PDB file of C-alpha atoms in Angstrom:
ATOM      1  CA  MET A   1       5.411  17.377   4.527  1.00  0.00           C
ATOM      2  CA  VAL A   2       9.217  17.554   4.607  1.00  0.00           C
ATOM      3  CA  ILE A   3       9.310  14.680   2.103  1.00  0.00           C
ATOM      4  CA  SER A   4       8.886  15.499  -1.526  1.00  0.00           C
ATOM      5  CA  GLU A   5       5.714  14.017  -3.025  1.00  0.00           C
ATOM      6  CA  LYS A   6       8.235  12.310  -5.325  1.00  0.00           C
ATOM      7  CA  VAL A   7      10.021  10.297  -2.615  1.00  0.00           C
ATOM      8  CA  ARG A   8       6.836   9.578  -0.644  1.00  0.00           C
ATOM      9  CA  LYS A   9       5.176   8.257  -3.785  1.00  0.00           C
ATOM     10  CA  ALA A  10       8.130   5.891  -4.238  1.00  0.00           C
ATOM     11  CA  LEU A  11       8.194   4.896  -0.573  1.00  0.00           C
ATOM     12  CA  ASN A  12       4.458   4.299  -0.961  1.00  0.00           C
ATOM     13  CA  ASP A  13       4.837   2.082  -4.029  1.00  0.00           C
ATOM     14  CA  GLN A  14       7.473   0.133  -2.121  1.00  0.00           C
ATOM     15  CA  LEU A  15       5.056  -0.372   0.751  1.00  0.00           C
ATOM     16  CA  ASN A  16       2.617  -1.708  -1.820  1.00  0.00           C
ATOM     17  CA  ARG A  17       5.236  -4.008  -3.369  1.00  0.00           C
ATOM     18  CA  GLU A  18       6.095  -5.836  -0.173  1.00  0.00           C
ATOM     19  CA  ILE A  19       2.430  -6.314   0.696  1.00  0.00           C
ATOM     20  CA  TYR A  20       2.311  -8.180  -2.611  1.00  0.00           C
ATOM     21  CA  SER A  21       5.500 -10.019  -1.639  1.00  0.00           C
ATOM     22  CA  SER A  22       3.598 -11.067   1.478  1.00  0.00           C
ATOM     23  CA  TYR A  23       0.696 -12.326  -0.652  1.00  0.00           C
ATOM     24  CA  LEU A  24       2.863 -14.131  -3.232  1.00  0.00           C
ATOM     25  CA  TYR A  25       4.846 -15.886  -0.501  1.00  0.00           C
ATOM     26  CA  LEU A  26       1.593 -16.918   1.174  1.00  0.00           C
ATOM     27  CA  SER A  27       0.383 -18.248  -2.162  1.00  0.00           C
ATOM     28  CA  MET A  28       3.523 -20.377  -2.551  1.00  0.00           C
ATOM     29  CA  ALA A  29       2.532 -21.811   0.816  1.00  0.00           C
ATOM     30  CA  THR A  30      -0.893 -22.847  -0.477  1.00  0.00           C
ATOM     31  CA  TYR A  31       0.988 -24.723  -3.153  1.00  0.00           C
ATOM     32  CA  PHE A  32       3.549 -26.182  -0.707  1.00  0.00           C
ATOM     33  CA  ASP A  33       0.769 -27.192   1.712  1.00  0.00           C
ATOM     34  CA  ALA A  34      -1.084 -28.699  -1.244  1.00  0.00           C
ATOM     35  CA  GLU A  35       1.901 -30.787  -2.402  1.00  0.00           C
ATOM     36  CA  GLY A  36       2.591 -31.897   1.156  1.00  0.00           C
ATOM     37  CA  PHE A  37       5.702 -29.856   1.964  1.00  0.00           C
ATOM     38  CA  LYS A  38       4.669 -28.502   5.347  1.00  0.00           C
ATOM     39  CA  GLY A  39       8.129 -27.147   6.106  1.00  0.00           C
ATOM     40  CA  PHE A  40       8.471 -25.290   2.817  1.00  0.00           C
ATOM     41  CA  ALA A  41       5.002 -23.838   3.439  1.00  0.00           C
ATOM     42  CA  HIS A  42       5.849 -22.893   7.025  1.00  0.00           C
ATOM     43  CA  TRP A  43       8.871 -20.972   5.750  1.00  0.00           C
ATOM     44  CA  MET A  44       7.102 -19.097   2.963  1.00  0.00           C
ATOM     45  CA  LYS A  45       4.429 -18.280   5.545  1.00  0.00           C
ATOM     46  CA  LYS A  46       6.980 -16.674   7.833  1.00  0.00           C
ATOM     47  CA  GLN A  47       8.574 -14.995   4.825  1.00  0.00           C
ATOM     48  CA  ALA A  48       5.115 -13.423   4.484  1.00  0.00           C
ATOM     49  CA  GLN A  49       4.955 -12.157   8.056  1.00  0.00           C
ATOM     50  CA  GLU A  50       8.457 -10.717   7.545  1.00  0.00           C
ATOM     51  CA  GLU A  51       7.587  -8.761   4.425  1.00  0.00           C
ATOM     52  CA  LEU A  52       4.540  -7.419   6.300  1.00  0.00           C
ATOM     53  CA  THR A  53       6.750  -6.171   9.125  1.00  0.00           C
ATOM     54  CA  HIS A  54       8.748  -4.356   6.458  1.00  0.00           C
ATOM     55  CA  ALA A  55       5.564  -2.649   5.229  1.00  0.00           C
ATOM     56  CA  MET A  56       4.843  -1.515   8.782  1.00  0.00           C
ATOM     57  CA  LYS A  57       8.257   0.176   8.942  1.00  0.00           C
ATOM     58  CA  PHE A  58       7.612   1.874   5.593  1.00  0.00           C
ATOM     59  CA  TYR A  59       4.131   2.780   6.802  1.00  0.00           C
ATOM     60  CA  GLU A  60       5.240   4.461   9.999  1.00  0.00           C
ATOM     61  CA  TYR A  61       8.195   6.215   8.360  1.00  0.00           C
ATOM     62  CA  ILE A  62       5.895   7.859   5.828  1.00  0.00           C
ATOM     63  CA  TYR A  63       3.814   9.289   8.683  1.00  0.00           C
ATOM     64  CA  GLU A  64       6.743  10.559  10.765  1.00  0.00           C
ATOM     65  CA  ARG A  65       8.058  12.162   7.598  1.00  0.00           C
ATOM     66  CA  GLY A  66       4.658  13.837   7.744  1.00  0.00           C
ATOM     67  CA  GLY A  67       3.084  12.116   4.715  1.00  0.00           C
ATOM     68  CA  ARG A  68       0.288   9.592   4.339  1.00  0.00           C
ATOM     69  CA  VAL A  69      -0.012   6.051   2.939  1.00  0.00           C
ATOM     70  CA  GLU A  70      -2.520   4.954   0.298  1.00  0.00           C
ATOM     71  CA  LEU A  71      -3.093   1.264  -0.388  1.00  0.00           C
ATOM     72  CA  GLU A  72      -3.559  -0.019  -3.925  1.00  0.00           C
ATOM     73  CA  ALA A  73      -5.195  -3.099  -5.340  1.00  0.00           C
ATOM     74  CA  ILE A  74      -3.427  -6.440  -4.862  1.00  0.00           C
ATOM     75  CA  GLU A  75      -3.600  -8.641  -7.955  1.00  0.00           C
ATOM     76  CA  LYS A  76      -4.076 -12.396  -7.632  1.00  0.00           C
ATOM     77  CA  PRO A  77      -0.743 -14.245  -7.278  1.00  0.00           C
ATOM     78  CA  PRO A  78       0.360 -17.395  -9.076  1.00  0.00           C
ATOM     79  CA  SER A  79      -1.010 -20.369  -7.169  1.00  0.00           C
ATOM     80  CA  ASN A  80       0.659 -23.347  -8.847  1.00  0.00           C
ATOM     81  CA  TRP A  81       4.187 -23.849 -10.277  1.00  0.00           C
ATOM     82  CA  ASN A  82       6.093 -26.795 -11.803  1.00  0.00           C
ATOM     83  CA  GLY A  83       7.614 -28.229  -8.601  1.00  0.00           C
ATOM     84  CA  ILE A  84       9.625 -27.275  -5.547  1.00  0.00           C
ATOM     85  CA  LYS A  85      12.351 -25.819  -7.732  1.00  0.00           C
ATOM     86  CA  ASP A  86       9.926 -23.905  -9.908  1.00  0.00           C
ATOM     87  CA  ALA A  87       8.355 -22.324  -6.830  1.00  0.00           C
ATOM     88  CA  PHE A  88      11.640 -21.528  -5.090  1.00  0.00           C
ATOM     89  CA  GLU A  89      12.965 -20.269  -8.382  1.00  0.00           C
ATOM     90  CA  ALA A  90      10.043 -17.876  -8.288  1.00  0.00           C
ATOM     91  CA  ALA A  91      10.895 -16.629  -4.807  1.00  0.00           C
ATOM     92  CA  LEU A  92      14.429 -15.992  -6.098  1.00  0.00           C
ATOM     93  CA  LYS A  93      13.451 -13.834  -9.105  1.00  0.00           C
ATOM     94  CA  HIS A  94      10.938 -11.899  -6.972  1.00  0.00           C
ATOM     95  CA  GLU A  95      13.583 -11.390  -4.289  1.00  0.00           C
ATOM     96  CA  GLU A  96      15.812 -10.027  -7.036  1.00  0.00           C
ATOM     97  CA  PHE A  97      13.285  -7.619  -8.600  1.00  0.00           C
ATOM     98  CA  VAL A  98      12.718  -6.088  -5.175  1.00  0.00           C
ATOM     99  CA  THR A  99      16.499  -5.890  -4.683  1.00  0.00           C
ATOM    100  CA  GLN A 100      16.606  -3.825  -7.874  1.00  0.00           C
ATOM    101  CA  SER A 101      13.455  -1.888  -6.865  1.00  0.00           C
ATOM    102  CA  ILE A 102      15.059  -0.849  -3.599  1.00  0.00           C
ATOM    103  CA  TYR A 103      18.131   0.273  -5.542  1.00  0.00           C
ATOM    104  CA  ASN A 104      16.028   2.749  -7.535  1.00  0.00           C
ATOM    105  CA  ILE A 105      14.384   4.136  -4.355  1.00  0.00           C
ATOM    106  CA  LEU A 106      17.875   4.407  -2.816  1.00  0.00           C
ATOM    107  CA  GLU A 107      19.159   6.324  -5.798  1.00  0.00           C
ATOM    108  CA  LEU A 108      16.004   8.449  -6.250  1.00  0.00           C
ATOM    109  CA  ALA A 109      16.295   9.380  -2.561  1.00  0.00           C
ATOM    110  CA  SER A 110      19.917  10.485  -2.884  1.00  0.00           C
ATOM    111  CA  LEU A 111      19.096  12.317  -6.123  1.00  0.00           C
ATOM    112  CA  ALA A 112      16.340  14.024  -4.163  1.00  0.00           C
ATOM    113  CA  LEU A 113      18.956  14.997  -1.514  1.00  0.00           C
ATOM    114  CA  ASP A 114      16.804  13.227   1.107  1.00  0.00           C
ATOM    115  CA  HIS A 115      19.498  12.431   3.678  1.00  0.00           C
ATOM    116  CA  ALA A 116      17.042  10.737   6.041  1.00  0.00           C
ATOM    117  CA  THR A 117      15.103   8.324   3.829  1.00  0.00           C
ATOM    118  CA  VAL A 118      18.390   7.139   2.343  1.00  0.00           C
ATOM    119  CA  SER A 119      19.694   6.505   5.849  1.00  0.00           C
ATOM    120  CA  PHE A 120      16.358   4.834   6.640  1.00  0.00           C
ATOM    121  CA  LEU A 121      16.570   2.666   3.529  1.00  0.00           C
ATOM    122  CA  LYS A 122      20.125   1.783   4.664  1.00  0.00           C
ATOM    123  CA  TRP A 123      18.838  -1.175   6.623  1.00  0.00           C
ATOM    124  CA  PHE A 124      16.766  -2.580   3.778  1.00  0.00           C
ATOM    125  CA  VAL A 125      19.481  -2.932   1.110  1.00  0.00           C
ATOM    126  CA  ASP A 126      21.495  -4.962   3.623  1.00  0.00           C
ATOM    127  CA  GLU A 127      18.418  -6.846   4.808  1.00  0.00           C
ATOM    128  CA  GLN A 128      17.859  -8.026   1.280  1.00  0.00           C
ATOM    129  CA  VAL A 129      21.377  -8.949   0.228  1.00  0.00           C
ATOM    130  CA  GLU A 130      20.826 -11.459   2.987  1.00  0.00           C
ATOM    131  CA  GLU A 131      17.300 -12.595   2.074  1.00  0.00           C
ATOM    132  CA  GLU A 132      18.063 -13.283  -1.576  1.00  0.00           C
ATOM    133  CA  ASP A 133      21.340 -15.003  -0.610  1.00  0.00           C
ATOM    134  CA  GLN A 134      19.243 -17.344   1.538  1.00  0.00           C
ATOM    135  CA  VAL A 135      16.779 -18.054  -1.265  1.00  0.00           C
ATOM    136  CA  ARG A 136      19.453 -18.806  -3.874  1.00  0.00           C
ATOM    137  CA  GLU A 137      21.097 -21.081  -1.286  1.00  0.00           C
ATOM    138  CA  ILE A 138      17.756 -22.833  -0.837  1.00  0.00           C
ATOM    139  CA  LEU A 139      17.456 -23.414  -4.589  1.00  0.00           C
ATOM    140  CA  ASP A 140      21.100 -24.489  -4.971  1.00  0.00           C
ATOM    141  CA  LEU A 141      20.377 -27.185  -2.380  1.00  0.00           C
ATOM    142  CA  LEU A 142      17.250 -28.714  -3.891  1.00  0.00           C
ATOM    143  CA  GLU A 143      19.273 -29.012  -7.081  1.00  0.00           C
ATOM    144  CA  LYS A 144      22.008 -31.415  -5.883  1.00  0.00           C
ATOM    145  CA  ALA A 145      19.225 -33.244  -4.088  1.00  0.00           C
ATOM    146  CA  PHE A 146      18.392 -34.216  -7.699  1.00  0.00           C
ATOM    147  CA  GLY A 147      14.842 -35.258  -6.896  1.00  0.00           C
ATOM    148  CA  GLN A 148      16.238 -37.587  -4.231  1.00  0.00           C
ATOM    149  CA  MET A 149      13.332 -37.429  -1.875  1.00  0.00           C
ATOM    150  CA  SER A 150      15.290 -38.501   1.226  1.00  0.00           C
ATOM    151  CA  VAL A 151      17.038 -35.096   1.412  1.00  0.00           C
ATOM    152  CA  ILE A 152      14.217 -32.935   0.178  1.00  0.00           C
ATOM    153  CA  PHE A 153      12.296 -33.957   3.253  1.00  0.00           C
ATOM    154  CA  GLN A 154      15.548 -33.151   5.031  1.00  0.00           C
ATOM    155  CA  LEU A 155      15.281 -29.570   3.724  1.00  0.00           C
ATOM    156  CA  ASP A 156      11.498 -29.340   4.182  1.00  0.00           C
ATOM    157  CA  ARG A 157      12.076 -30.429   7.767  1.00  0.00           C
ATOM    158  CA  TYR A 158      14.854 -27.898   8.208  1.00  0.00           C
ATOM    159  CA  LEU A 159      13.392 -24.801   6.609  1.00  0.00           C
ATOM    160  CA  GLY A 160      10.220 -25.936   8.406  1.00  0.00           C
ATOM    161  CA  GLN A 161      11.721 -24.939  11.746  1.00  0.00           C
ATOM    162  CA  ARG A 162      12.698 -21.372  10.944  1.00  0.00           C
ATOM    163  CA  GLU A 163      11.326 -19.362  13.860  1.00  0.00           C
TER     164      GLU A 163
ATOM    165  CA  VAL B   1     -12.544 -35.008   2.787  1.00  0.00           C
ATOM    166  CA  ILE B   2     -14.440 -31.714   2.533  1.00  0.00           C
ATOM    167  CA  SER B   3     -16.808 -31.605  -0.386  1.00  0.00           C
ATOM    168  CA  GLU B   4     -15.870 -29.307  -3.253  1.00  0.00           C
ATOM    169  CA  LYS B   5     -18.882 -27.122  -2.401  1.00  0.00           C
ATOM    170  CA  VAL B   6     -18.073 -26.690   1.295  1.00  0.00           C
ATOM    171  CA  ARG B   7     -14.481 -26.036   0.192  1.00  0.00           C
ATOM    172  CA  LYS B   8     -15.482 -23.291  -2.228  1.00  0.00           C
ATOM    173  CA  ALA B   9     -17.517 -21.454   0.417  1.00  0.00           C
ATOM    174  CA  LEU B  10     -14.673 -21.512   2.952  1.00  0.00           C
ATOM    175  CA  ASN B  11     -12.150 -20.468   0.327  1.00  0.00           C
ATOM    176  CA  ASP B  12     -14.208 -17.393  -0.548  1.00  0.00           C
ATOM    177  CA  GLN B  13     -14.711 -16.634   3.126  1.00  0.00           C
ATOM    178  CA  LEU B  14     -10.933 -16.752   3.580  1.00  0.00           C
ATOM    179  CA  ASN B  15     -10.455 -14.293   0.719  1.00  0.00           C
ATOM    180  CA  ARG B  16     -13.247 -12.082   2.112  1.00  0.00           C
ATOM    181  CA  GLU B  17     -11.574 -11.958   5.538  1.00  0.00           C
ATOM    182  CA  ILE B  18      -8.324 -10.901   3.845  1.00  0.00           C
ATOM    183  CA  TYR B  19     -10.126  -8.001   2.174  1.00  0.00           C
ATOM    184  CA  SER B  20     -11.335  -7.049   5.635  1.00  0.00           C
ATOM    185  CA  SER B  21      -7.811  -6.848   6.994  1.00  0.00           C
ATOM    186  CA  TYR B  22      -6.999  -4.680   3.961  1.00  0.00           C
ATOM    187  CA  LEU B  23     -10.082  -2.476   4.251  1.00  0.00           C
ATOM    188  CA  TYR B  24      -9.397  -1.778   7.927  1.00  0.00           C
ATOM    189  CA  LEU B  25      -5.746  -0.963   7.328  1.00  0.00           C
ATOM    190  CA  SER B  26      -6.849   1.414   4.560  1.00  0.00           C
ATOM    191  CA  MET B  27      -9.197   2.962   7.167  1.00  0.00           C
ATOM    192  CA  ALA B  28      -6.106   3.318   9.323  1.00  0.00           C
ATOM    193  CA  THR B  29      -4.433   5.200   6.434  1.00  0.00           C
ATOM    194  CA  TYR B  30      -7.264   7.693   6.537  1.00  0.00           C
ATOM    195  CA  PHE B  31      -7.234   8.036  10.334  1.00  0.00           C
ATOM    196  CA  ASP B  32      -3.512   8.820  10.769  1.00  0.00           C
ATOM    197  CA  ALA B  33      -3.844  11.268   7.858  1.00  0.00           C
ATOM    198  CA  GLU B  34      -6.635  13.125   9.657  1.00  0.00           C
ATOM    199  CA  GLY B  35      -4.603  12.963  12.862  1.00  0.00           C
ATOM    200  CA  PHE B  36      -6.340  10.342  15.056  1.00  0.00           C
ATOM    201  CA  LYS B  37      -3.671   7.913  16.205  1.00  0.00           C
ATOM    202  CA  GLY B  38      -5.994   6.127  18.609  1.00  0.00           C
ATOM    203  CA  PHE B  39      -8.565   5.424  15.920  1.00  0.00           C
ATOM    204  CA  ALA B  40      -5.763   4.412  13.535  1.00  0.00           C
ATOM    205  CA  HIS B  41      -4.136   2.188  16.146  1.00  0.00           C
ATOM    206  CA  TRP B  42      -7.591   0.621  16.698  1.00  0.00           C
ATOM    207  CA  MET B  43      -7.997  -0.062  12.955  1.00  0.00           C
ATOM    208  CA  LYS B  44      -4.526  -1.641  12.911  1.00  0.00           C
ATOM    209  CA  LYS B  45      -5.371  -4.133  15.661  1.00  0.00           C
ATOM    210  CA  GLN B  46      -8.574  -4.983  13.787  1.00  0.00           C
ATOM    211  CA  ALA B  47      -6.915  -5.692  10.429  1.00  0.00           C
ATOM    212  CA  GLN B  48      -4.261  -7.902  12.018  1.00  0.00           C
ATOM    213  CA  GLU B  49      -7.161  -9.534  13.842  1.00  0.00           C
ATOM    214  CA  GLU B  50      -8.946 -10.178  10.544  1.00  0.00           C
ATOM    215  CA  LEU B  51      -5.691 -11.702   9.356  1.00  0.00           C
ATOM    216  CA  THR B  52      -5.642 -14.212  12.223  1.00  0.00           C
ATOM    217  CA  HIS B  53      -9.197 -15.316  11.361  1.00  0.00           C
ATOM    218  CA  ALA B  54      -8.095 -15.832   7.766  1.00  0.00           C
ATOM    219  CA  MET B  55      -5.244 -18.155   8.714  1.00  0.00           C
ATOM    220  CA  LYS B  56      -7.556 -20.227  10.930  1.00  0.00           C
ATOM    221  CA  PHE B  57      -9.832 -20.732   7.938  1.00  0.00           C
ATOM    222  CA  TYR B  58      -6.503 -21.599   6.266  1.00  0.00           C
ATOM    223  CA  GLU B  59      -5.214 -24.303   8.599  1.00  0.00           C
ATOM    224  CA  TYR B  60      -8.728 -25.789   8.581  1.00  0.00           C
ATOM    225  CA  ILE B  61      -8.949 -26.013   4.779  1.00  0.00           C
ATOM    226  CA  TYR B  62      -5.764 -28.034   4.928  1.00  0.00           C
ATOM    227  CA  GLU B  63      -6.780 -30.141   7.918  1.00  0.00           C
ATOM    228  CA  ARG B  64      -9.661 -31.365   5.740  1.00  0.00           C
ATOM    229  CA  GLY B  65      -7.549 -32.114   2.677  1.00  0.00           C
ATOM    230  CA  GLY B  66      -8.414 -28.973   0.740  1.00  0.00           C
ATOM    231  CA  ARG B  67      -6.288 -26.232  -0.763  1.00  0.00           C
ATOM    232  CA  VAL B  68      -6.451 -22.461  -0.456  1.00  0.00           C
ATOM    233  CA  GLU B  69      -6.611 -20.459  -3.632  1.00  0.00           C
ATOM    234  CA  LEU B  70      -5.813 -16.768  -3.123  1.00  0.00           C
ATOM    235  CA  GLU B  71      -7.949 -14.443  -5.262  1.00  0.00           C
ATOM    236  CA  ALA B  72      -7.305 -10.818  -6.179  1.00  0.00           C
ATOM    237  CA  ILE B  73      -7.742  -8.223  -3.452  1.00  0.00           C
ATOM    238  CA  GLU B  74      -9.784  -5.244  -4.662  1.00  0.00           C
ATOM    239  CA  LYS B  75      -8.559  -1.775  -3.867  1.00  0.00           C
ATOM    240  CA  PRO B  76     -10.061  -0.447  -0.633  1.00  0.00           C
ATOM    241  CA  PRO B  77     -11.649   2.958  -0.329  1.00  0.00           C
ATOM    242  CA  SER B  78      -9.140   5.450   1.037  1.00  0.00           C
ATOM    243  CA  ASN B  79     -11.302   8.412   2.171  1.00  0.00           C
ATOM    244  CA  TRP B  80     -14.542   8.915   4.075  1.00  0.00           C
ATOM    245  CA  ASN B  81     -16.417  11.985   5.312  1.00  0.00           C
ATOM    246  CA  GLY B  82     -15.386  11.726   8.956  1.00  0.00           C
ATOM    247  CA  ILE B  83     -14.818   9.312  11.816  1.00  0.00           C
ATOM    248  CA  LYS B  84     -18.416   8.128  12.117  1.00  0.00           C
ATOM    249  CA  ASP B  85     -18.782   7.817   8.345  1.00  0.00           C
ATOM    250  CA  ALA B  86     -15.831   5.422   8.490  1.00  0.00           C
ATOM    251  CA  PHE B  87     -17.078   3.450  11.499  1.00  0.00           C
ATOM    252  CA  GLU B  88     -20.347   3.580   9.578  1.00  0.00           C
ATOM    253  CA  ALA B  89     -18.589   1.736   6.756  1.00  0.00           C
ATOM    254  CA  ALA B  90     -17.147  -0.589   9.442  1.00  0.00           C
ATOM    255  CA  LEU B  91     -20.459  -1.756  10.909  1.00  0.00           C
ATOM    256  CA  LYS B  92     -21.981  -2.334   7.487  1.00  0.00           C
ATOM    257  CA  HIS B  93     -18.929  -4.286   6.281  1.00  0.00           C
ATOM    258  CA  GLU B  94     -19.063  -6.711   9.234  1.00  0.00           C
ATOM    259  CA  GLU B  95     -22.839  -7.022   9.127  1.00  0.00           C
ATOM    260  CA  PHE B  96     -22.362  -8.492   5.669  1.00  0.00           C
ATOM    261  CA  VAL B  97     -19.657 -10.975   6.636  1.00  0.00           C
ATOM    262  CA  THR B  98     -21.972 -11.980   9.519  1.00  0.00           C
ATOM    263  CA  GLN B  99     -24.675 -13.021   7.062  1.00  0.00           C
ATOM    264  CA  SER B 100     -22.071 -14.667   4.815  1.00  0.00           C
ATOM    265  CA  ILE B 101     -21.017 -16.877   7.731  1.00  0.00           C
ATOM    266  CA  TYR B 102     -24.631 -17.930   8.319  1.00  0.00           C
ATOM    267  CA  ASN B 103     -25.010 -19.027   4.703  1.00  0.00           C
ATOM    268  CA  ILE B 104     -21.919 -21.248   5.072  1.00  0.00           C
ATOM    269  CA  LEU B 105     -23.243 -22.502   8.445  1.00  0.00           C
ATOM    270  CA  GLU B 106     -26.418 -23.431   6.579  1.00  0.00           C
ATOM    271  CA  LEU B 107     -24.678 -24.796   3.423  1.00  0.00           C
ATOM    272  CA  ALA B 108     -22.445 -26.966   5.609  1.00  0.00           C
ATOM    273  CA  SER B 109     -25.235 -28.125   7.884  1.00  0.00           C
ATOM    274  CA  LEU B 110     -27.258 -29.133   4.834  1.00  0.00           C
ATOM    275  CA  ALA B 111     -24.171 -30.919   3.575  1.00  0.00           C
ATOM    276  CA  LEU B 112     -24.239 -32.493   6.261  1.00  0.00           C
ATOM    277  CA  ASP B 113     -20.635 -31.578   7.069  1.00  0.00           C
ATOM    278  CA  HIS B 114     -20.888 -31.560  10.858  1.00  0.00           C
ATOM    279  CA  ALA B 115     -17.167 -30.708  11.039  1.00  0.00           C
ATOM    280  CA  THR B 116     -17.187 -27.375   9.213  1.00  0.00           C
ATOM    281  CA  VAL B 117     -20.471 -26.473  10.997  1.00  0.00           C
ATOM    282  CA  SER B 118     -18.928 -26.859  14.455  1.00  0.00           C
ATOM    283  CA  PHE B 119     -15.812 -24.854  13.571  1.00  0.00           C
ATOM    284  CA  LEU B 120     -17.739 -21.981  12.012  1.00  0.00           C
ATOM    285  CA  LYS B 121     -19.553 -21.734  15.381  1.00  0.00           C
ATOM    286  CA  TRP B 122     -16.348 -20.241  16.836  1.00  0.00           C
ATOM    287  CA  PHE B 123     -16.578 -17.552  14.155  1.00  0.00           C
ATOM    288  CA  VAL B 124     -20.330 -17.027  14.378  1.00  0.00           C
ATOM    289  CA  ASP B 125     -19.622 -16.199  18.002  1.00  0.00           C
ATOM    290  CA  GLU B 126     -16.346 -14.216  17.613  1.00  0.00           C
ATOM    291  CA  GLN B 127     -17.938 -12.459  14.613  1.00  0.00           C
ATOM    292  CA  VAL B 128     -21.077 -11.630  16.641  1.00  0.00           C
ATOM    293  CA  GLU B 129     -18.947  -9.629  19.046  1.00  0.00           C
ATOM    294  CA  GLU B 130     -16.816  -7.988  16.379  1.00  0.00           C
ATOM    295  CA  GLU B 131     -19.898  -6.060  15.280  1.00  0.00           C
ATOM    296  CA  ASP B 132     -20.757  -5.147  18.841  1.00  0.00           C
ATOM    297  CA  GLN B 133     -17.342  -3.595  19.411  1.00  0.00           C
ATOM    298  CA  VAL B 134     -18.040  -1.490  16.313  1.00  0.00           C
ATOM    299  CA  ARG B 135     -21.732  -1.003  17.116  1.00  0.00           C
ATOM    300  CA  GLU B 136     -21.133   0.726  20.451  1.00  0.00           C
ATOM    301  CA  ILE B 137     -18.382   2.887  18.957  1.00  0.00           C
ATOM    302  CA  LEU B 138     -20.688   4.166  16.222  1.00  0.00           C
ATOM    303  CA  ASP B 139     -23.031   5.144  19.083  1.00  0.00           C
ATOM    304  CA  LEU B 140     -20.199   6.140  21.406  1.00  0.00           C
ATOM    305  CA  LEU B 141     -19.813   8.374  18.363  1.00  0.00           C
ATOM    306  CA  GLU B 142     -23.341   9.498  17.154  1.00  0.00           C
ATOM    307  CA  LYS B 143     -23.996  10.864  20.652  1.00  0.00           C
ATOM    308  CA  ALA B 144     -20.579  12.517  20.087  1.00  0.00           C
ATOM    309  CA  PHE B 145     -21.898  14.580  17.082  1.00  0.00           C
ATOM    310  CA  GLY B 146     -19.235  17.042  17.697  1.00  0.00           C
ATOM    311  CA  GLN B 147     -17.707  17.544  21.143  1.00  0.00           C
ATOM    312  CA  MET B 148     -14.276  16.935  19.607  1.00  0.00           C
ATOM    313  CA  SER B 149     -13.395  16.980  23.325  1.00  0.00           C
ATOM    314  CA  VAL B 150     -14.796  13.523  24.134  1.00  0.00           C
ATOM    315  CA  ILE B 151     -14.097  12.315  20.578  1.00  0.00           C
ATOM    316  CA  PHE B 152     -10.521  12.866  21.756  1.00  0.00           C
ATOM    317  CA  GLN B 153     -11.244  11.128  25.041  1.00  0.00           C
ATOM    318  CA  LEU B 154     -12.576   8.332  22.826  1.00  0.00           C
ATOM    319  CA  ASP B 155      -9.624   8.323  20.431  1.00  0.00           C
ATOM    320  CA  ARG B 156      -7.265   8.102  23.427  1.00  0.00           C
ATOM    321  CA  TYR B 157      -9.244   5.191  24.877  1.00  0.00           C
ATOM    322  CA  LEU B 158      -9.586   3.269  21.610  1.00  0.00           C
ATOM    323  CA  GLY B 159      -5.875   3.925  21.131  1.00  0.00           C
ATOM    324  CA  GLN B 160      -4.810   1.564  23.925  1.00  0.00           C
ATOM    325  CA  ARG B 161      -6.495  -1.540  22.541  1.00  0.00           C
ATOM    326  CA  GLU B 162      -4.019  -4.384  22.509  1.00  0.00           C
TER     327      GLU B 162
END
């Protein structure tokens, strides 16, 4: 182990946090499927495969560092919200808490003098000043829709074709 | 149009198959720790395979006008007493899902939901070769007892599963 047990613990908690991001985004699908937004569910669903691919990268990095991963319990996510906005609001806060979480690991890793993990985390800070700019954009759109259903379908149908 | 009862049983089965993906990944976090990348690679294909099963239960529960509810995922075990002790846990885990499919297959045939019955039959099959992949490994093991030599032959071979 060239990592410190301190930085590998934090990289391990971050692996656990995105697994839960993958479960919470899947759960927002179950709601969006339930309320008939197939395109909003499709998107959440692929936001869940994307957070899982992030966990893989954390997973493998821990092991090349020399360390080992330990998985923790996943607690049951919210299943129902107050509407499309309330759900996509929720994706926005969660995509902000993880933006802050990855700031602490970034710091922590520079405080620890870990030049590699910092560099490795370089891609994730950028990755997620995108992702939570997308989500806010999403929510700023369904506002001016104003419950006008014509253009919510328009957004369902458009986020529904993210590949 | 699924009944509430047939729904409930498929919703639990979906949450059980998710725990299986998680358990097998956890088993992969023990295997790379102990230095077997083939066995860990093999557990990683399996978990992601359990995932796929759990999204087919998913699209089906919405084809029939139901909704998935996602329950809490218990913490997996993280250590066992060796490779065969883990693949021991493997076989037993997927013997129990195999009997939990049958009970749904009954429950739905009594329903008489002929639609969920027919679809489970894909799983009943695919599930009754999942155990046999694990069954022969446990014995591909057991006769291995030791000879870390062929255990390493084995780990190499398992490690190329796609």
